[PDB]
Design a protein around this nucleic acid. Structure first.
Ligand SMILES: [Zn+2]
Lengths: 140, 72, 54, 139, 189, 115, 101, 57, 139
RNA sequence: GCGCGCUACACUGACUGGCUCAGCGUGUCCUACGCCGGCAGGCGCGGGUAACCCGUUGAACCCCAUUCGUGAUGGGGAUCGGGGAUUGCAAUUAUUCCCCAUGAACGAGGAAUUCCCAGUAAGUGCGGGUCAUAAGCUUGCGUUGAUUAAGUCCCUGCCCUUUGUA
């Protein structure tokens, strides 16, 4: 309703370009590793009003949203929401964000390709790895 | 073409709304958003705020279509 | 020997079941405990009691 | 004036407001996080959904008696959309229905039946019929 | 007395042309509280002539795949549309509907006599029922199509369409199509 | 190396029970249901094949039709010949492949080249 | 003598109606308290299978129905009289089941 | 424990059918026409209708 | 002192029990205005507006609805009410008054007294519905 | 490269909450009720060989509020990474099932071509058959519910009668 005095038009968080125009709950879905569910609970756990547009958030609020997004375990986000539950190497629970998720994916793909596991070979050839029929469909 | 509608009111649009909206033959979230280049949510919020002041009458309320009108 | 002849378990599955008439294991009607091939049922439908009305 | 005589939409909102004002309804720890079924995509928008669900549950139990967790799971069921697979009827969450009935038992509004289900108590019937009274009075 | 949605009178409405005077039902003895009748008006020939024109509109409204049997919603679309109509123009919506159907109906059509591939058409007259049919069909397709992918709703799109159609505005889809069909009949003759 | 925050040296000494939860849900269920005769028979063959081997040179190949055997800390270092339906495919069981099956490391069909 | 009930179940209607009517008029003439035929919902067994053995045709289907008609007649009479009235009434194409309390 | 009315009436159907198939393959030579089965809890009777009974005895 | 008649649409059935009293109107213990499909509220008000409340003055009707769907139930209940009134004004009033009611009810819509007989048609093999067939591909 | 299909391309729509109605028919495997887990499910104790118990079969579209706003978007959910359960002796080429994450084509489809006349078309769920695990299939059942036609032999074929034929 009221005119915004300092509307931050573009947000620069976690090496991502967040559009303040979209509502905050859906605004932060643009970050890879964050969906329409995890975004909601993150904001609710920080007790921010979801009604607010992403452009009209103060420095401390967005800094709280970043720090609660990084380390979820500290702020009582359940175990069954974490993107990475049991990490193959170190075996701990964590939420992996854009750069981390890309790095973790290529690492997991490399790990499978290293041992010559069927999934790895099916990945290396650029085929389906969930056991669909690849005859009739899935062209290009 | 791409329609770049305004999320929040600017002074040039806000004063234009408070003066001119108040007197149109038909009042609704659609026509206001189209004419003044406003977002659907802000245009829907604006009509609710004008009803709280008491410049505009609510003709019939519904999920899909909320119809407003000028008085006298 | 004794422990490899009919050794494979058949409690469930298509191989465990068979037609009561011809001992075939394809297109088997196991509703109401008919336990009979669809071809054999069509032959014995009349004298069982099943009638064609509409 | 009785629950049946008033509008059933406004009645739930009135009863929810009463259950909030009482301030003695044991809300779980996971209200902020958990969905309300297998087939919902997001968490409920309203922050005070537990009170509206509790109010709804009480009203359902007023209208007919001997309603268990399974029945309440059957009440709040809906349409599961399975992407490219066609849509089928899915049931509600059992835990939320159980915790709601446990929480309402806490108020002494509902008690267990000798037959096996859960019926509304005369204290409950009083509260529900009173809420109906002022909901009717507000027109 | 009987009034549509218990708030629109059916006495002050007036028909212009005698040709359609017995093919637009909305009058004293056809006065209904709601469009929704669930009658057997498509049972045999010339029975839908006795269907209320508001029912014909709301029936022809639920057309495309996703809304095939969603009448309860077209009735509220027509209800909102009628309210929008009254707010915009001022007078009885039923008069605007009748005026729209009067204007929109093509008077001379073209019929195919010849072979497939080649175009060779004879210009012929249009029956009063077929005039009413095409008028309703064109109005709904104009409404529908106009509001498919833009913000204004079906209710105010249907209203806008009937406002334009009733006063014979070139902007109306139904008027453009009528004009074109009569121009093609004029091209053949 | 480490698996689920546990280095191999204490995977070896770790018993059958607390090894269960470290594995993924499928394997955990399999170990819960318990191994039959032929699985134990293979383990016995593999530990013997390792025990009799030299300390420098790798254990001698142990051939098998068991594609559905889970890799265990016991099996790390072993030379397994897995049956693909036609022939035997020789695999050296590395520490990193301690979650999967034998079947995954012996491909059944030839990769398709079009013409 | 207390509450013997008689469950008559058949596939034919005519034979079932005839035999049950005979049991009723047989009981009525002896001056015995009888609660009349309680007709339960007719059980219809449906089997729908392809006509063809091979599977080449226009995909035609048979529709095999099997009807089960069930009647209950209730008596407040002694077991000695119930035994002989149940004994005399036999018919090929009806099943009779007698229960006490 | 007793089976359902539905399964019972089916079971009697298969009994009839299988008995007929057996009787046909046995008494085909003696012109076996048909069979009639009457069931009583005391004792169930099977009645064979054939062309030349002197032989089938 | 009372009469009891049924109104029927598709598989919907609404039984109205009509006795003497203070113009009471209840369906499944709920008033007409509080029936869920409010969009068609007028369809329930059809028989009472056509005749006028004055005729309902000395009549309490209690309607109970079972089977069918929402709109089918609406057509069952609105049929049942009118059939109940004409049955009562037949039995305990002159035939002239019954005729004076009947002619008005029939003249408006024949559906109010005479039941719509058509039912959901049986489906045949070779297609999805009762008439429609699956797509037939040549080459 | 073709042939049945299912989900879509959104605002007459998604999402969140509230309200209120079925019918066919199946259960020696169908399941009520109580407890624990977010959920898939885990335990304990009952009813039913069935108008008796599941079950008053509280089904979905639809109806009424909330949020969204023409943006490949809170349309669409393909493909892919982690986990957590149930069958089964055995699940990897992932049987089904659940959770978080990833977010492709697709803006109504060229030549061409199918099906259909009233409780019909179409939307929309539910039960049966396969069934240890089990429906994008078929076979049934309700539910909401239309537009257009009451005609013609033009196309594609059919029946009868005349002729013509190497
Ligand atoms: Zn057979």
């Amino acid at each position: 309703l009221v005119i915004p005095e300092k509307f931050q038009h573009i947000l620069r968080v976690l090496n991502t370009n967040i559009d303040g125009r979209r509502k905050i709950a859906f605004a932060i879905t643009a970050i890879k590793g964050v969906g329409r569910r995890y975004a909601h609970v993150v904001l609710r756990k920080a007790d921010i009003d979801l009604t607010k547009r992403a452009g009209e958030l103060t420095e401390d609020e967005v800094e709280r949203v970043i720090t609660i997004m990084q380390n979820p375990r500290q702020y009582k986000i359940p175990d069954w929401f974490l993107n990475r539950q049991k990490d193959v190497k170190d075996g701990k629970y964590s939420q992996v964000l854009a750069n981390g998720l890309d790095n973790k994916l290529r690492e997991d793909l490399e790990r499978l390709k290293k041992i010559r596991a069927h999934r790895g070979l099916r990945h290396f050839w650029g085929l389906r790895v969930r056991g669909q029929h690849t005859k009739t469909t899935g062209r290009r | 073409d791409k329609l770049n509608n305004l999320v929040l009111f600017d002074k040039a649009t806000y004063d234009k709304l408070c003066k001119e909206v108040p007197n149109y033959k038909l009042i609704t979230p659609a026509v206001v958003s189209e004419r003044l280049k406003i977002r659907g949510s802000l245009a829907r919020a604006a009509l609710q705020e004008l009803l709280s002041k008491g410049l505009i009458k609510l003709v019939s309320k519904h999920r899909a279509q909320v119809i407003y009108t000028r008085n006298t | 020997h004794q422990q490899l002849y009919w050794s494979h378990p058949r409690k469930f599955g298509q191989g465990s079941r068979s037609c009561r008439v011809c001992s075939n294991r394809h297109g088997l009607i196991r509703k109401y405990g008919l336990n009979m091939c669809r071809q054999c049922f069509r032959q014995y439908a009349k004298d069982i009691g099943f009638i064609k009305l509409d | 004036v009785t629950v049946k005589d008033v509008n059933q939409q406004e009645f739930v909102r009135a009863l929810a407001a009463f259950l909030k004002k009482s301030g003695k309804l044991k809300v779980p720890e996971w209200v902020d996080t958990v969905k309300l079924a297998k087939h919902k995509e997001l968490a409920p928008y309203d922050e005070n959904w537990f009170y509206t669900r509790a109010a709804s549950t009480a009203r359902h139990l007023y209208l007919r008696g001997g309603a268990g967790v399974g029945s309440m799971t059957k009440i709040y069921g809906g349409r599961q959309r399975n992407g490219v697979m066609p849509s089928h009827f899915s049931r509600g969450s059992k835990s939320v229905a159980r915790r709601v009935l446990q929480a309402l038992e806490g108020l002494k509004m509902v008690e267990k039946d000798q037959d096996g289900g859960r019926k509304l108590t005369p204290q409950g019937q009083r509260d529900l019929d009173r809420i109906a009274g002022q909901v009717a009075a507000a027109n | 007395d009987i009034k549509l949605f218990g708030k629109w009178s059916t006495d002050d409405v007036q028909i212009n042309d005698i040709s359609l005077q017995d093919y637009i039902a909305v009058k004293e003895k056809y006065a209904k509280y709601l469009p929704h009748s669930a009658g057997r008006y498509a049972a045999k020939r010339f029975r839908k002539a006795q269907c209320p024109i508001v029912e014909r509109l709301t029936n022809s409204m639920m057309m495309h795949g996703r809304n095939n049997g969603k009448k309860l919603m077209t009735v509220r679309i027509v209800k909102h549309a009628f309210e929008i109509i009254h707010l915009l123009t001022g007078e009885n919506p039923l008069q605007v509907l009748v005026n729209a159907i009067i204007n929109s109906g093509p008077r001379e059509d073209s019929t195919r006599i010849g072979r497939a591939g080649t175009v060779r058409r004879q210009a012929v007259d249009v029956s009063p029922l077929r005039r009413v049919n095409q008028a309703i069909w064109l109005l709904c397709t104009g409404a529908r199509e106009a509001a498919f992918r833009n913000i204004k709703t079906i209710a105010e799109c249907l209203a806008d369409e009937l406002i334009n159609a009733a006063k014979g505005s070139s902007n109306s889809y139904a008027i453009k199509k009528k004009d074109e069909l009569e121009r093609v009949a004029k091209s053949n003759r | 190396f480490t698996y689920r925050g546990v280095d191999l040296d204490q995977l070896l000494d770790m018993s059958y029970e607390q090894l269960m939860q470290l594995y993924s849900a499928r394997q955990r269920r399999r170990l819960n249901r318990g191994l039959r005769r032929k699985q134990h028979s293979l383990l016995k063959r593999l530990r013997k094949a390792k025990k009799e081997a030299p300390p420098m040179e790798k254990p001698e190949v142990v051939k098998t039709h068991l594609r559905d055997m889970i890799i265990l800390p016991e099996m790390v270092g072993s030379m397994v010949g897995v049956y693909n339906g036609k022939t035997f495919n020789q695999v050296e069981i590395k520490p990193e492949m301690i979650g999967h099956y034998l079947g995954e490391f012996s491909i059944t069909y030839k990769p398709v080249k079009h013409g | 003598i207390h509450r013997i009930r008689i469950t008559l179940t058949s596939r034919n209607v005519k034979s079932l109606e005839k035999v049950c009517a005979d049991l009723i008029r047989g009981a009525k003439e002896k001056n015995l308290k009888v609660k009349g035929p309680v007709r339960m919902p007719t059980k219809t067994l449906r089997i729908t299978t392809r006509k063809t053995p091979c599977g080449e045709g226009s995909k035609t289907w048979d529709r095999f129905q099997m009807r089960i008609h069930k009647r209950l007649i209730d008596l407040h009479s002694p077991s000695e009289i119930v035994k002989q009235i149940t004994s005399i009434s036999i018919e090929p194409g009806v099943e009779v089941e007698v229960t006490i309390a | 424990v007793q089976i359902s009315k539905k399964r019972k009436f089916v079971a009697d159907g298969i009994f009839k059918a299988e008995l007929n198939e057996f009787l046909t393959r046995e008494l085909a030579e003696d012109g076996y026409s048909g069979v009639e089965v009457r069931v009583t809890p005391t004792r169930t009777e099977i009645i064979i209708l054939a062309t030349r009974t002197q032989n089938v005895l | 002192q009372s009469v009891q008649v049924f109104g029927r649409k598709k598989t919907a059935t609404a039984v109205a029990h009509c006795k003497r009293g203070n113009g009471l109107i209840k369906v499944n213990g709920r008033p007409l205005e509080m029936i869920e499909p409010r969009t068609l509220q007028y369809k329930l008000l059809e028989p009472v507006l056509l005749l006028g409340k004055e005729r309902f003055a000395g009549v309490d009707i209690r309607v109970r609805v079972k089977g069918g769907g929402h709109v089918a139930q609406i057509y069952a209940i609105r049929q049942s009410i009118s059939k109940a009134l004409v049955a009562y004004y037949q039995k305990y009033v002159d035939e002239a008054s019954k005729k004076e009611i009947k002619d008005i009810l029939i003249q408006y819509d024949r559906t109010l007294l005479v039941a719509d007989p058509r039912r959901c048609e049986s489906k045949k093999f070779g297609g999805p519905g009762a008439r429609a067939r699956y797509q037939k591909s040549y080459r």
